[PDB]
């Protein structure tokens, strides 16, 4: 019979708190980003560079609180974060994404981002179309916050990331998170919403790999132009590539 152990309940509590400590639903800090410009030769690049850089900082903060993550070597923590950062940003952004107008709504017209805004940061439909598809499919899962933070943590602690040294340790940590998620869904998610839910969640991890691949290709092209690179933040340059 499915039963969330005390430990699994503890893992969930820790991750919910970690998320609450690293995701501000008032988006107050957004006022401090370089201003968004919607007229446009990459007019949204400065604002979205800052939104992404900010988000990388928060993902790192969330990652550090994942049970087990601190047990990893510095090298492995770095590899896992560089590879997962954009995917976790895609995942965590689903909180602001709305299917009303298919945009990321962060509390005002200024900080409401649609497909044209993302295009004005340099990205093309090769990435943007499937990204919206992803946000829609993820939103429709109607995840509990418990499942949302578990999925972000499972995403970060992935054994198969390029450059991972101690794959076994990473796998052990992820398995503990996965089993927590699987047990949570069985015990705590009522039907029909729970139907095929874990499988659908794990499929989203596969979708994220493809989005990650395309993002990396487009980031390389965009960051190749020094006049774009001068407008990036140092953290973005370090994590995504310099």
């Amino acid at each position: 019979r499915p039963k969330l152990s005390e430990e699994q309940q503890h893992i969930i509590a820790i991750l919910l708190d970690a998320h609450h400590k690293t995701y501000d639903p008032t988006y107050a800090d957004f006022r401090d980003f370089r201003p968004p410009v919607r007229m446009s030769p990459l007019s949204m690049l400065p604002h979205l560079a800052d939104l992404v850089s900010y988000s990388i900082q928060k993902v790192i903060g969330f990652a550090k609180m994942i049970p087990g993550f601190r047990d990893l070597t510095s090298d492995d923590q770095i590899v896992l974060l560089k590879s997962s950062a954009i995917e976790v940003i895609m995942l965590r952004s689903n909180q602001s994404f709305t299917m009303d107008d298919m945009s990321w709504d962060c509390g005002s017209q200024d900080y409401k981002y649609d497909v044209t805004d993302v295009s004005k940061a340099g990205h093309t439909l090769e990435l943007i179309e499937p990204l919206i598809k992803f946000q829609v499919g993820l939103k429709k899962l109607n995840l509990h916050e418990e499942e949302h933070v578990l999925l972000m943590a499972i995403c970060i602690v992935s054994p198969d990331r390029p450059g991972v040294q101690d794959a076994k340790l990473v796998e052990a940590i992820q398995d503990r998170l996965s089993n927590t998620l699987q047990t949570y869904i069985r015990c705590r998610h009522p039907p029909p919403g729970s139907h095929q839910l874990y499988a659908k969640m794990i499929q989203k991890l596969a979708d994220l790999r493809s989005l990650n691949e395309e993002h990396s290709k487009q980031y390389r092209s965009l960051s190749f132009q020094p006049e774009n690179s001068m407008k990036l933040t140092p953290l973005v340059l370090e994590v995504f590539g310099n």
Binding site: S74, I78, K82, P234, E238
Partner: peptide, 11 residues
């Protein structure tokens, strides 16, 4: 590849 800022944020 050396990541000063990432490394510092992880400490």
């Amino acid at each position: 590849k050396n990541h000063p800022m990432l490394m510092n944020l992880l400490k």
